[PDB]
Every structure is written in C-alpha cells, then in structure tokens.
Amino acid sequence: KEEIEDLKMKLVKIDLEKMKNAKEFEKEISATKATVEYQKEVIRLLRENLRRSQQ
C-alpha cells in the first residue's frame, strides 16, 4: 500500500512535467511563428522602400 502511494505520487509528478513541457512547447511555437509573421512584414516594408527608391 505504501508502494501504491509512491506510484501515485510519481504519476502526479510525471503528468505535471508533461503539462509543463507541453505549455512551454506551445509558448515557443507561438512566439516563433509570430516572429515569422513579424519578419514577413519587415520584408514587405523593405521591398516597398526599395521599389520606390528605384523608381
């Protein structure tokens, strides 16, 4: 019965580490994808200023 208790605490720990990692993953995918969109706009601004400087 002591083992059941230890196993259940280990189950609680491993699930919490699973949740923590999944939330960090989600956070970093979102921030990195937002950077991709931010730099897509920077690139658009660079093309527009370059067109006008050339014309």
Next chain:
Amino acid sequence: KEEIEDLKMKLVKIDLEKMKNAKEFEKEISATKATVEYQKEVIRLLRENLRRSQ
C-alpha cells in the same frame, strides 16, 4: 497487485507521451527557427541594397 500493474503501465504510457511530444516539438521548432534565420538573412541583404539605392 492489479492496481500496482495499472499504475506502472500508466507511468510508462505517460513517459512515452512525454518523449513523443518532445520529439514533435523539436521537429516543428527547428523547421520554424530555420525559416526565421533565413528571413533574418534576407532582411540583412535587402537592408544593404536599400542603403545602396539611397
């Protein structure tokens, strides 16, 4: 012992999901970070061209 068996299985199942999630994260993050780094290089090179043009 039956409950012990269920717990040990559940421990194995969760550690397996942890590894699976980790691998899928690392796959996607590396692809996206690659796009980010190519974008940064495009940006540097376009900025040079713009400074030249002006």
